[PDB]
Ligand binder design. Structure first.
Ligand SMILES: Cc1cc2nc3c(=O)[nH]c(=O)nc-3n(C[C@H](O)[C@H](O)[C@H](O)COP(=O)(O)OP(=O)(O)OC[C@H]3O[C@@H](n4cnc5c(N)ncnc54)[C@H](O)[C@@H]3O)c2cc1C
Length: 378
């Protein structure tokens, strides 16, 4: 088999490339390791929370790919790329020739060892969600290891489905990449009075009884899924390195979405997948579109508590810090001279957005004597 445009991976990024290539190129093939068409992966929590199926989260149904003549090979996994012969080798041993290759292979969950746990689950795929659904009914409760957004959202989804759940983290407070200590503890409190318990400073060896009796899910982050490039000269660091055209180190090979690293950024967000996938498809069909960095992200969809975080909060060495704790909201604002370098707000997206804009536009503040004076100049 041989095609014009070969798309390696059929998630949101791959889908967006196919859609972009439509009308412009007339021979498009998508390879996907899963047995499902491209689906809106961030809604996996709804499979758990609302008992929705794959059909409810698919981006396009079968008929769309047929009407548009896009060929999807499901349950097939690329293992090798031969760039000079333009051949991709699959798990079966079958080879596919391409004129252009778009790598859209997304991410893979970080795997950690958890003491006392026979089976460790993580939530990446639709099949993952189902496995979690069933163990939660089987065990009767869940224990989520990992201090991030996804771990918290999953806990609520599992609560919503009708199963108790709590979280275990190794640090003192959750969300340490997005929040300072006081921010995280503010969040922990709000989550704890909402029935989402977080075990802090955990030693999992000492949590045998809970671990044993729970469905254990690790939510410890994700990395670009790119082992199949190992023998090639395709440049990578964390992700596959791409320019603004989504072109890799190697001619006629592109990458986009979760697998791709653009000016050192690999944020792992769906709007980036959609937009990078689009640019890749367009370029693969000979239209020299440029991706520009977009990215805001209002987190998180959890327990009706909203968070926006901007800049390097975790390791910030600011000249000045302004903090506000209220009943409904938490604000932290970190200065570098007369500029806001980093900020996070819990419970006021309107304010977080103003701080975001100030940071992004690099607004200078001639008055830094008080938080009030900064707020008035946003
Ligand atoms: C539970 C969960 C919640 C999320 N919530 C949010 C959110 O709120 N906001 C947000 O912005 N993002 C969220 N995300 C992330 C979002 O889903 C991703 O950014 C987006 O799916 C990336 O799309 P992608 O096409 O680059 O990668 P993927 O969605 O991972 O798709 C890549 C596809 O390629 C396949 N593949 C991998 N290797 C091969 C290979 N060797 N050969 C052939 N096929 C291969 C994979 O099976 C996969 O189907 C969430 C993710 C998860 C898992």
């Amino acid at each position: 088999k041989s095609t014009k445009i070969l798309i390696l991976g059929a998630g949101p990024a791959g889908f967006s490339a196919a859609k972009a290539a439509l009308g412009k190129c007339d021979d498009i093939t998508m390879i996907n390791s899963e047995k499902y068409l491209p689906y809106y992966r961030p809604r996996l929590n709804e499979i758990i929370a609302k008992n929705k199926s794959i059909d409810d989260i698919l981006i396009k149904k079968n008929d769309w790919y047929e009407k548009n003549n896009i060929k999807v090979i499901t349950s097939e996994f690329a293992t090798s790329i031969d760039p000079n012969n333009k051949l991709v080798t699959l798990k079966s041993g079958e080879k596919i020739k391409y004129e252009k290759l778009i790598i859209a292979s997304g991410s893979i969950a970080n795997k950690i060892k958890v003491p006392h746990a026979d089976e460790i689950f993580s939530l990446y795929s639709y099949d993952d969600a189902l496995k979690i659904k069933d163990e939660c009914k089987n065990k009767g409760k869940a224990f989520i290891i990992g201090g991030g957004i996804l771990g918290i959202e999953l806990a609520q989804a599992i609560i919503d489905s009708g199963t108790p759940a709590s979280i275990g983290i190794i640090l003192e407070y959750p969300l340490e990449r997005q929040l300072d200590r006081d921010g995280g503890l503010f969040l922990k409190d709000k989550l704890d009075r909402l029935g989402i318990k977080i075990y802090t400073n955990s030693n999992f060896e000492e949590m045998g009884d809970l671990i044993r009796s729970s469905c254990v899910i690790t939510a410890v982050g994700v990395k670009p899924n790119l082992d199949f490039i190992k023998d090639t000269e395709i440049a990578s660091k964390r992700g596959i390195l791409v320019n603004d055209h989504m072109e890799t180190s190697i001619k006629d090979i592109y990458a986009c979405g979760d697998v791709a690293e653009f000016y050192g950024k690999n944020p792992g967000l769906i709007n980036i997948a959609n937009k990078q996938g689009e640019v890749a498809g367009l370029n693969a069909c000979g239209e020299d579109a440029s991706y520009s960095e977009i990215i805001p992200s209002p987190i998180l969809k959890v327990s009706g508590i909203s968070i926006i975080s901007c800049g390097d909060i975790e390791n910030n060495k600011p000249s000045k810090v302004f903090r506000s704790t209220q009943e409904d909201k938490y604000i932290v604002c970190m200065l570098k001279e007369n500029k806001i370098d980093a900020a996070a707000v819990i419970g006021d997206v309107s304010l977080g957005t103003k701080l975001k804009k100030a940071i992004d536009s690099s607004k200078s503040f001639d008055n830094i004597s008080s938080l009030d004076a900064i707020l008035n100049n946003l």
